């Protein structure tokens, strides 16, 4: 059991992350990455998620930062070599974190390069109201602003808002469609309640014809 | 300085 | 233009039905059936819907009844020869109406046979909460009761209720899932409203650095 | 007598 225990450690670490015990998430990821590396090899497609989560938690630990870069770039390669949309989106995510490492490294022109890389990938596969696109636009405007490109920084912040505003539009439509569906489901339920008496009459109508009926009725017909 | 990265984890829902 | 005008006449008649001008729906159907018969032949698969709607409106007109039978049985054949679920369900519907013609004809053992035929078909392809199954069970219990089989009549009426009750169960779940989805869509909308100020700060933060910034800032970096 | 067929068109939603 190796693929068995490796997924467990991914869960362990992911929720040590969401809880914020990061040395304990790094630990979970470092061993998952070690169980897969020693079963499939440390460039194998089976190691891509494990390495990306490992480098994600290495980036957070530096908040070493150089080990985050190795692990995220390895993940990008593993991810980009496969032509699945799931994998291409994970490649985008590895670019997003590689850009986050650049910003920690005060290397702002590369963050722009990695954030743009994430965005070009994500816009091929995601709808114009995906918060992930609001995140890349915002992270891109951060990089541009840190790099002191203030006009392109504003442009990216406004793109972020434009995505966030588009999603409030879609969500309000889905409210009206949910609450409207709810309205019709409720109306049909009452329509069906009012059918059950009329059918119960037909049942009792029949039970009386059988009580009053003798056995010869059917066989003389 | 690092409130910028918290706003990012807020723009994405995680 | 023949397939062009034939669909129009199906619409015309269908809504002369839903309005209740039945001689005007029969007229629409008789000509659609004549446009398809003289282009594809009067056993062709292209004539199945047109003949079924025609015989459906002939049955209602008798409320002649013999012409309803011809047209519905032709439709059943056209429908059953094709292995599509849409066509098999239409075959079931032709059986339902052929059974309705039997009841008008005081021929109750055949109604049982045709209603059962509808049901065996519909239970292969429909979910246990489809009102169409409540209709067949009810129409079947009518036939059984008219034929003076009172115990099987009750059985079919109770099956009808059982279907109707199952659908009230499914509809209440969909209410809770709609109104619950609505609840979460509303919550995320407010979460997104509270993001737009923080991003607008980042924009104004940047616009001030550009106002105060001169042109040499970027090119000396 | 023919209220029976109206209840059927009510059980199905048409």
Author numbering:
A (entry chain B), C (entry chain B): 38 to 100, 175 to 332
B (entry chain V), D (entry chain V): 120 to 133
Sentences from the study reporting this entry:
NASP is a major histone chaperone for H3–H4 dimers critical for preventing histone degradation. NASP and its homologues share an atypical tetratricopeptide repeat (TPR) domain. They constitute the SHNi-TPR (Sim3-Hif1-NASP interrupted TPR) family, predicted to have four TPR motifs with the TPR2 motif being interrupted by a long acidic region, a capping helix region immediately following the TPR4 motif, and a disordered C-terminal region containing a nuclear localization signal (NLS). Here, we report the crystal structures of the sNASP dimer, the complex of sNASP with an H3 α3 peptide, and the sNASP–H3–H4–ASF1b co-chaperone complex.
The resulting sNASPc-H3 α3 covalent complex showed two peaks corresponding to the dimer and monomer conformations (hereafter referred to as sNASPc-H3 α3 dimer and monomer, respectively) on the chromatogram during gel-filtration purification. After extensive crystallization trials with the sNASPc-H3 α3 dimer and monomer, we successfully solved a 2.85 Å crystal structure of the sNASPc-H3 α3 dimer (stereo view in Figure 2C). Each of the two H3 α3 molecules adopts a helical conformation highly similar to the one in the nucleosome structure and is encompassed within a groove in the concave side of each sNASPc protomer. Moreover, the groove is amphipathic with a hydrophobic pocket located on one side and is surrounded by lots of conserved and negatively-charged residues. The H3 α3 forms extensive interactions with the conserved residues of sNASPc that line up the groove. The most prominent feature is that the main-chain carbonyl groups of H3 Arg129 and Ile130 establish three hydrogen bonds with the side chain of sNASPc Arg242, thus forming a helix-capping interactions. Another feature is that the side chains of H3 Leu126 and Ile130 are bound into the hydrophobic pocket formed by Arg242, Ala245, Glu246 and Tyr249 in NASPc α7, as well as Ser271 and Ile275 in sNASPc α8, and Leu306′, Glu309′, Ile310′ and Lys313′ from sNASPc’ α89′. Our ITC assays revealed that the sNASPc single mutants R242A and L306A and the triple mutant E246A Y249A L253A (EYL3A), all disrupted complex formation between the sNASPc dimer and H3 α3, whereas the other sNASPc mutants (in dimer conformation) only had intermediate effects on the binding with H3 α3. Superimposition of the canonical H3–H4 dimer structure/fold onto the H3 α3 helix bound by sNASPc shows lots of steric hindrances, indicating that the H3 α3-binding mode of sNASP is not compatible with binding to an H3–H4 dimer in a canonical histone fold conformation as observed in the nucleosome structure.
